[model samples]
Target chain A: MEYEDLELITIWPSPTKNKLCQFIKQNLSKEHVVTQLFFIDATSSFPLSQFQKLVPPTLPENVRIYENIRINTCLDLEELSAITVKLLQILSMNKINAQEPLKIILYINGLEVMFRNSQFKSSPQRSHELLRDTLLKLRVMGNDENENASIRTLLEFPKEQLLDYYLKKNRIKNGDSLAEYIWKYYADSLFE
Target chain B: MEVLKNIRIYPLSNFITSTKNYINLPNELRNLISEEQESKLGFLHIIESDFKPSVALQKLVNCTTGDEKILIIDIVSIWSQQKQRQHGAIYMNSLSCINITGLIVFLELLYDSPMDALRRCQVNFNFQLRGIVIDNLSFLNNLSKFEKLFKILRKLREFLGCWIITKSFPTDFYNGIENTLVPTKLPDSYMKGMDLIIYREVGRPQYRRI
Candidate 1:
């Protein structure tokens, strides 16, 4: 199933990467536009030519030029959290008028790698909680004065099983489990 | 419609270093594209030597001005030069940067249908597009897929009036000559579409043919 403009959602089995890359190049990188994009590779796969291709080939917007397009090579969950916080700052801080909210799209790739990383295998629950907390912050978007700036997060997992493993574990007994919350509201749920 | 002065506060510019008004490509290489006819050009890096044709292309672009930028759309991961991959992070988190105009990389061409990739490539036609440096076409190993891919590129040339430089595998191109308009009975079977073709010898830096 597919959804658009989700605050925090997941795409299993991976969608066409070109579409994502194409979107970033054509729509997201315009400096004049209020929306900015941040690309994080949790596997630390370090996409260059791949990432490089995403750069809009015109002025002040070089691959080296850092304004609207940001590609980060996050090696672990901790780095992910820190960078997420930085992005949040980018989202929350309003410089002048509120004409058009400053939007930040955290288009993360291989987020499943953070869950299955060998280094964090023993402490999987910790990473889960960490991710859940960050996503919760993201999940609760557009609700306050910071509404002047909001974030739309989209995560792409390499596979469905692992994406399930990451979201399904540590389910709360009642109320809304983080998984349920995400599945219910955060995602672009398909039931019309 | 709004501006944030502090955007660079969270800096991460890495892929490129500097830009100049003009890049003087070796006269020989420049001449290939300069002779300018219509069919587009192709370069075969005949061996895996010190010369990386993609890097050369990147340099050509690095020197190109933003106003008339030549876009580099790599279906190949030529920029991930192993060690280059390892060091990509250093500058990723570093301080300053500059923009190298027009780069579109679609490395997952194998996963996504070529028709879709080609379609996406054709979506935006900018007059400033100096040309496209397509990394390689070896992925279209099947003739049908090859035909499908080639047809779109040809159409792009016609519509955009832009030249295309396709990267080639070691033997995708070769040398020959003509006698009386028939292009001499070449000793080899050459790929007959590209108007410009050049090949590199197994161990040299310059791309040449004879």
Candidate 2:
């Protein structure tokens, strides 16, 4: 299939603790709230070089920048894990005095990301191993934050009942909300 | 006597190259052919001729299949020039003289859908065909259609061979089962031109070049 039909994963950090908390509260459901949060100190200078190496040299037009976060469209499960590890590493190394942990979230079609499809047709066991590796990598990097500060990871799935909420009240009719249309048709097939 | 099963592919270069009023087949190829004959291999030959259609006609006539049937599907008219027409008439006359039974059908009638063509072939032919020849394949626009066509041909897995002739190697048409026969590009220094390059198990997991 063409690149235009693929789903995009947007990764960005919240600038402030208040902004992060408020954004999570407004966007995510109450059940999706973090029971236990870890904080990571943020520095003034961003890890630009570290972030630069995380992405491939030749990026497709499908992957783009929105505000400060890196938006990727063609990454599969393995690729996403590699990118996630790098982002967390950069965050851990560049930590500074912060009231709350730096919030890093992956958004797909304006909803939380999930592992669905694999690019290389990896077996279920291999896919689960990759997922576990990414989670472990995040925990290892976050453990460093526990000594200095802490970081919060908010990874959850959107409710099946609320999946059609974006289509309600004539919000999406015909060609309206191209992202929603893509999500409705194209996004679901992407995940496991 | 056991019927040895094998598939033989003749490159277009070997089919086209003419020296002293005859196709210039290398000694190595001749030896290979002799070996197959001596071993009494009951094989089918699939010839992919781009520049020379006359060579394919000659091969079809001479090749022995031991009571097996030959099914020829002429998608596009191979007779464009006076030379091709002359050769075409000669081949038809030769077929009549030898008392060989062959079926030639136009692909235009089966152009509606891939499945339709497949079903028609299945219904029309009662005997198991040992060989299938598609004279012209450039008429098919894309790889997907070509794949479907290949799928239909592959239904007779017990068949000895299938040949698909196209103007150029459709790089997209590699599916690992069919071997490819291409013309070897010669340097400017060579006075005599035309050599065959055989690629075995093309589009497979690993390629073996010959």
Candidate 3:
């Protein structure tokens, strides 16, 4: 699996700082374009059903849901990679486009908002563009009083600093996307 | 040695690779593996190892006999890479030994559809399960539904004759059970009708009882 085919998005509840992680895979084939959603210990079952109601009826068949009860706040790179491979395999087997970039809406708990993936890149000269875009998306949605108040209290930081903090907290390495590393690790383990 | 008809418990902390590796036995006692098989009708290996469950299940099923004792080792790790199918083609076949390592996966299989999983064990295999060894009991503590987990085990207890539950933690959550066996600092005699033996080894803390 290539690094460009995967994206790891993290969402934080404002004052509480409880993190919700979403790993997305976009299948890019022309015959079948699909997106896979994995929630790492979302803790609530209600949001998924609500999100189902929000999504267009036509795309329901394309969406896949997986829940890990054991996962709480954090995921190590190896763990993340393992899950990525498992999801990728599921998409591949189902004949979904396992190569394209996917558009994912931020659905934390019950709040829903779509974010553009234009700035997000596997490798970029500007390292923090991904993080900047995420924060900007949240900022734009902050105006609605009816929206989730917890999400509105967004944290402000330079993309590089935020990336550094994310790396330190999650214990992910500097260069390797977890998917690439796990792919190599899985292949290596097969021979050993 | 007499046939182990009574429910026995062998508690341990880490993974027990094989029956030969777990206990130190006399030349006469070492032959018990074969001896017991002759007396008993069949043997079963209910594996729940950190290794892939399907591959381990296939290997054990292909090799073992009917009269051998059921060996339950460290079957499932909480951190597994693959998503285990609740019902697979492998479960449809009858085998003397079944390796189920994923603790939660095992519980879910039993809880969600008890009759299906139970049918695979009882009717399909046609081997009465004499002994059961759960490798790590502490993993249950990590589960959000720990309180309800025991109820499922209690139901399984009706079918299982002997129980060997192992855990790494020092806490004695299973103190109240009757006829329990707790291991000593050194090796002890392999006595008959010993219901529970809590074997706590140092360093890795592996425990077992036959």
Candidate 4:
């Protein structure tokens, strides 16, 4: 249950947020990387039609990714914590999978929305870093508790938001080269 | 057999723990732990998810509401914390005891001042009140509001002669003291109960308290 199991993908702009959500939905339907996807929708903008357009009628007709996926919304950071843990608890209680530990994805649609919660009540960047650490703790803990499931997290943030780069030997710096940025950090970011 | 008029204490977990303590001590020392007419302290209980909401609320009510009709105003039960859903069962069990006059729930955005809300609850329930237990205060998360809270309670006590209790989730409670520093900081005034704790923790609880 090392942090290698978690990825914080920041696909930005308002439109790109939903675009990447659709991207994840589409690719997840196409790929067999994960079986159970928990889409924690904090932003709550995407219409069902947009999602349906991506993976419309069904996946394999019987085992739709829509059917396989669980979608829940949270307005605040505390609720987000509860929902994520409850989702993990349910995943943990499931029977051991025949094969893969890499079978679950936990995607948060609006992690930036956490900054608005009064519980964190700091500057937006500070709050994001604070709760991002909490989220990382959750991912690692969930990975440990569930032997049959590995949860990958997708945290949606606009391009401008500050990210907590997992610095080991590196002292703090901003705007590293994309190669070094992806390489030197614990969180992995990807482009569509 | 008397309660202090100016006593302000928040021995919260210790207060609850008082009721659920080691049994069968020598008779004189046995009388010391939780044997009060009632533990009448103006207290604040910081609740985290570690506690069962129902059980915590129940313990606070029973321990505080000795003979008087207590008003338990639930602030954010319907808002977010999913575990707060069991508030209904709480009223059922508490009302059966007849000490709790009402358990009020708020689902609205709390547009009115909480001061106004408390007085409103006062008039509506006619709980010309002895003890008041507010369920949640972490949402507002304002310092001035808390000052006003204690202020109103201060006045209410004159209007009181009883106690006021509240519960909230954790906020940044870090502050000062000596080697005895804990995550919880007591307000600048109440030094009486603050110094007299039977300190037996190898560590701390629910973050910490001092």
Candidate 5:
């Protein structure tokens, strides 16, 4: 099962901070907030719950476990990839190591989506072309791939659009539809 | 483990000398310099090459002072041939005679450019410049201009191994940025300093004489 995952810290450009914050706030609800508050209150009230049992009691209803899960894992592979690529581009432009953690935020939902998609495996040329066009759409970054036109290009744009356009073109309407599309895709593939 | 023998230095200096003067490097020493190391040193030799022999005769200053001797080598002709050659220049402040070896080497500020112009951070005068450059993606990351900074930093790091830290303050500032960006929340700042000391001793110096 795909789970919610968030990097506790991220090092995105200031321009994208509000967008990221808005994205997170938009997804979280009172139910989600209340459930977490209750969980914290219960855990603290009965401190023994920490290790009393390896597995605790199941979550009560109205908790919406899937929404909680969806909140973090809402970003599909393409979205995560897009963010990763942009973050990488900024880091590369600044000349920082790409592997640094806060610099690269990987979401489990995003990875699951990426792995389950085929567009992530386009030819190098196609990838380059896709990246070039995508960067034009992404106002924050532009073409800085001249030195190594092929490889550097990959770091400039979002990773999801490529997957959406290239992999699930017919199945997914737009990049935003990635979550439902993947859910359906996964469910159908699993049953089949 | 090919220890850098005194012999290697002798030939490297000789191969680098121009014919008009003794260029002291005789034929045998010339052969010892590998094509790769030679290419690296060649970049450094060019800055002094413009002296036109008159600058060579321009009364050596404070020869009696501290443990430093400056011996200028030239490579003007070579500079004209190479691309990205404009970035190469070693402006000297003084020369010091080596008290231990009696060897003369031209000493220049590791970073000579004004602070505003010092985008490359080629100020440290150790033999490990290249390693520092390779290691300092964080420093390089701060600069918005990628190409010029990347090219200069990479070449200097790879070839000379001598890099300038710019200023003690800048190194600390960059360190602060890195810490802020990807902090481990490691408790003590002193531990970080100690880690730096260990790294410096084990890692490469900014510059090394051939």
Candidate 6:
């Protein structure tokens, strides 16, 4: 199956700090924008409601939300890297990104993203930028692995070496984004 | 006092009156107020906002300039069960496990003072210690430098708590660490830890060993 044919849903609105939204928006061919935002954590309920109230009324009501939704709950960091690629493939097939801008929050570790792109340009610019901005703003909290933890760990990483380690390991030829290489070598490990 | 400060004086009373007035407001208008209140931190639910109710809030009162400051702390966990020893369980007198000593030295460098650094562990009671903050009682009695001390301790504690919570490790968790820098290995005159402990025990403002 093509990388883009998998089922992709938009859990949040467009241009969210959510990496899932970014992944779908940038990589998916026929983006399937899901209206509902799903949260695996129960504590997000009040904040999400407050967020809804703050949102302008003109926004679409396709607002579907689920809390504590169990989807791939136990996936490890390594497995999740593969899942991310599959998610991208699903987005590609569904054309979720092309459909319209999407918003989503997928609870996956930055380390997974880091390792997946290990073979890239010795600098996973996209992943590093994504993790730094997203984590710092408290927009996307840590995954289940680092729950209840201060976010400084993500901040302390030297972006250069982090990218370099993966690049050297994957032996990725130049000119590929972090997402591209994860798909190339570890395709089957993807969530789909 | 201004209207805002006056409001602060009788928060409960004003909140009740405001709720009644808001009840009479048009639904759209009420939604507007609700949205406005929710978006503005500390303005929405004084009783419920997570930020206002945190232990860090009290630490902020004791520490910050009322301006937000992001403090980051990193703790390295290096536990070893005796490697390269004659027996797996036993360590020879000569074969010392260097990781713990290395970490202690690294920790001292990362902190400002031995007393302030030790106080970080006490801040584990931060959230529950809110009433003490309300009463303006510094957890450590009569330490006039409590505010500054608390700030340093809070930052260190927060970082240590965060590091433990995250279970995060550096790529080379023990990279560049060596046990030789431990204070115990240094000259007896440089005994910061023992001196601080004695100072605490005596509760006097005198330096025993500079």
Root-mean-square deviation per candidate: 24.2, 25.4, 18.3, 15.7, 23.1, 25.2
lDDT of 1 by residue, B1-210 (tens): 245654555335532331211223544456554443211233222222222353454454443443454444433323322223321111111001011111212323412343454454332323244454554442222344344445555555555444555555442121100010112121132245555455654423566543
Evaluate every candidate with DockQ and list the scores. 0.01, 0.01, 0.04, 0.05, 0.01, 0.01
Q: Give every collision pair in model 1.
A: A53-B105, A57-B101, A57-B102, A62-B99, A62-B100, B178-B184
Q: Highest TM-score, which number?
A: 1
Off by over 4 Å in 6: A1-63, A67-70, A96-100, A109-192, B1-210
- Model 4's chain B yields a TM-score of 0.42
**Prediction 3: B-chain TM-score:** 0.33
Write the candidate numbers in order of decreasing lDDT.
1, 4, 2, 3, 6, 5
Could you give candidate 3's per-residue lDDT for residues A105-179 as a string of tens digits? 322321110111111322231222222223222322221112111111211112332343344454443443322
Give the top-scoring candidate (DockQ).
Answer: 4
Which scores better on DockQ, 3 or 5? 3
Q: Candidate 4: where is the Cα deviation over 4 Å?
A: A1-22, A25-27, A30-34, A58-63, A95-102, A120-133, A142-147, A162-192, B1-210
Tell how far residue B195 is off in model 1, in angstroms. 82
Clashing pairs in 4: B157-B160
lDDT of each: 0.43, 0.32, 0.29, 0.41, 0.25, 0.25
For model 2, the superposed segments whose C-alpha errors exceed 4 Å read A1-192, B1-29, B32-57, B61-68, B79-128, B159-210
Residue-by-residue lDDT tens digits, candidate 3, B1-210: 355766566767433332221122223223335553423312222212122233323332223245333324332221111132222212221111112234445655654665565564433544444333443332222223443344445455444432323322232222111102112111122111122333332324233333
TM-scores for chain A, candidates in order? 0.65, 0.38, 0.24, 0.60, 0.20, 0.26
When sorted by TM-score, best at the front, the candidate numbers are 1, 4, 3, 2, 5, 6
Q: Point out the worst 10-residue segment of candidate 2 chain B by lDDT.
A: B91-100
Over 4 Å off, model 3: A1-192, B1-115, B118-123, B140-144, B159-164, B167-210
Q: Residue-wise lDDT of candidate 1 within A1-192, one digit each (tens)? A: 221344234443454656565656655544544667778886544344664666544655554334566778876667777887786565545633444556667777765555446234545345555554455444444222245676666766444333334553453332322333234323432121
- Give the alpha carbon lDDT tens digit for every residue of B1-210 in model 6: 587666734457654352110111222123333454423211011111111122322222232222222221211011111111111111111001112232234244435453453344221222211101111011011222333433433354443321111111111211111111110111122222110211101123221211
